[PDB]
Amino acid sequence: GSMATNFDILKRLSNLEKHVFGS
Amino acid sequence: SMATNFDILKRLSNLEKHVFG
Amino acid sequence: TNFDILKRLSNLEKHVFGSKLYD
Numbered sequence: 001g002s003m004a005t006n007f008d009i010l011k012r013l014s015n016l017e018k019h020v021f022g023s
Numbered sequence: 024s025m026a027t028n029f030d031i032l033k034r035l036s037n038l039e040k041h042v043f044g
Numbered sequence: 045t046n047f048d049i050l051k052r053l054s055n056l057e058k059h060v061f062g063s064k065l066y067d
Contacts, residue, residue, distance in 0.1 A: 004031075
């Protein structure tokens with residue numbers, strides 16, 4: 001929804017995953 | 024809902040603080 | 045879509061904080 005758009009949620013989730021699972 | 028959205032944002036933001044500091 | 049987000053958050057949290065002794 002618009003919250004996810006306005007807060008860049010998918011981008012941020014993806015980056016977290018890269019750090020967490022990449023480590 | 025605001026509830027779902029607050030949960031998402033709190034959880035995401037806290038993980039960012041933890042992982043990135 | 046908010047559900048894919050919630051699922052990914054729960055998975056992240058488990059990976060970071062869950063015990064690695066649990067299969």
